[PDB]
Paper text:
The most prominent such domain has been identified by bioinformatics as part of [name] (Nsp3) of the virus and appropriately named the “[name]-unique domain” (SUD). SUDcore turns out to consist of two subdomains, SUD-N (Nsp3 residues 389–517) and SUD-M (525–652), each exhibiting the fold of a macrodomain. The two subdomains are connected by a flexible linker (residues 518–524) and a disulfide bond. Instead, we have demonstrated that full-length SUD and SUDcore bind oligodeoxynucleotides and oligoribonucleotides that form G-quadruplexes.
In this communication, we describe the crystal structures at 2.2 Å and 2.8 Å resolution (monoclinic and triclinic form, respectively) of the core of the [name]-unique domain (SUDcore, Nsp3 residues 389–652). Two crystal forms were observed under identical crystallization conditions: Form-1 crystals were monoclinic (space group P21, two SUDcore molecules per asymmetric unit) and diffracted X-rays to 2.2 Å resolution; form-2 crystals were triclinic (space group P1, four SUDcore molecules per asymmetric unit) and diffracted to 2.8 Å. Both structures were determined by molecular replacement. The r.m.s. deviations (on Cα atoms) between the models derived from the two different crystal structures are around 0.7 Å. In both crystal forms, SUDcore displays the same head-to-tail dimer, with the SUD-N subdomain of monomer A interacting with the SUD-M subdomain of monomer B, and vice versa. Approximately 1130 Å2 of solvent-accessible surface per monomer is buried upon dimerization. Involving ∼10 hydrogen bonds and four well-defined salt-bridges (AspB440…ArgA554, ArgB473…GluA619, ArgB554…AspA440, and GluB619…ArgA473), interactions between the monomers are largely hydrophilic. As to be expected, the structures of the monomers are very similar to one another, with r.m.s.d. values (for Cα atoms) of 0.58 Å between monomers A and B of the monoclinic crystal form, and 0.11–0.37 Å between monomers A–D of the triclinic form. In all six independent copies of the SUDcore monomer, residue Val611 adopts forbidden conformational angles. The side chain makes a hydrophobic contact across the subdomain interface and is also contacting the side chain of Phe406 of a symmetry-related SUDcore dimer in the crystal lattice in the monoclinic crystal form (this also applies to two of the four monomers in the triclinic form).
Author numbering:
A (entry chain A): 389 to 516, 524 to 652
B (entry chain B): 393 to 519, 524 to 652
The structure:
Amino acid sequence: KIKACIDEVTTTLEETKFLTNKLLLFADINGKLYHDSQNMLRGEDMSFLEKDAPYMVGDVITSGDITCVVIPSKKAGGTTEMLSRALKKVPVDEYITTYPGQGCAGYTLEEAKTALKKCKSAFYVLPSEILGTVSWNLREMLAHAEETRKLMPICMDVRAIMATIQRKYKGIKIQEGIVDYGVRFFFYTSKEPVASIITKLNSLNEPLVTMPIGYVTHGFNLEEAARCMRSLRAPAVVSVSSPDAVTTYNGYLTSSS
Amino acid sequence: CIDEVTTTLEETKFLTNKLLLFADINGKLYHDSQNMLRGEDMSFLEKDAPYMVGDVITSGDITCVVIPSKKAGGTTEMLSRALKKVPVDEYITTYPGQGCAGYTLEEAKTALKKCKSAFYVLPSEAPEILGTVSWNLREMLAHAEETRKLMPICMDVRAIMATIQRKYKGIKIQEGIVDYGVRFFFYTSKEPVASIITKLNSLNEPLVTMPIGYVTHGFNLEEAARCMRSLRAPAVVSVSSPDAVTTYNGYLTSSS
């Protein structure tokens, strides 16, 4: 059940803390917390969560007032029914939590809400850059990346883009990952899932100039590409098709699923 | 649009000639689409690989569409959009994206119904001849040791590992094949079900196993059964109680 959303308007954190001290965190099979659950921590010792890893979906781990549940991953085939069932394994109580299974190709906000509402526990739910969206063509993007020395993610499987690159940067040895030849490229495939490309770029944590990842290449429309791009944390200049798409994209990026 | 058929492929070919096959990014066909072939030259499908979701490839009367994979995050909306790229016509086809952790029958039906093309839908591979038993671990191990059958086991189930290590003292537990008293096939809860199923289908040998993914990967019995339809290697499958045998067989024999 969802007792309240902690929007700071209607409900506040310090006031909810009178009701319960218990937190419900969401983890993956590897014992790694979902980003929203990680942002709920304030220097608590989370070492205990790796002491018993790897986990099975539905595994419940408790240390003091922190409870962690191992949830199914949507980007690996997990359904809403599987999500609700992993939540039913949590001992019935009052918890401060977030929407489970957010973001790139993860569960939608409505699916996360449903799973929390279906649960028998009472939940106090905490809620889950625009300045970077441009409308530059490939030429303009390449010129920017060569001048700034920024990393430029590029889908290796877009034939028209590869021909342009090979003609502009003659003798380029195209290979997966980092290729520093005129421009510092980051070559990725349409085979590698978007969430995986995003994790690799988030890890590399450096300035990027890119198109919205997965748009067309991985079967995403603009909205779906934007929703996945929310999970990109590395500083990025993001180029959309037309100037008309800039506002559209910003709208999808700024919304709630 | 749709006309679900009780009749065979060779029989349906009297109605129309065009086939709609479903492929992945690598240009490899989905199992149901591969079973629709009768020695046709499929080399052309590799000539232009890798593909993007939505790519349409035609040679003669065979049309292939690159569909999104549900077991990799694909949605129904993505599936319907890839299908809208297929030229409007009459096709003999199957339900797209069937398989383990693939799209459900209702999601596949919806995507085909959303499409403007007219379909003659051949049934999926699913079902009398069943080896569903209700054996406990000890019984399963005794059977595997005497028959020398391969016994898939989830390495991350602590209680199962303790039993194994106590029965087969000195066992060096490692991923994959470990031949020590029983020929085990150790897998992780990290590896997806469809991937374990593919590895076992490839090894193609007699198995004695519990329904793959049940509990370990978050599946309830119904979901584990639905994934088990994709298992083709000969298998003895053990469920909890004798009461679960019929329940499981029901889920295995059913539609979705």
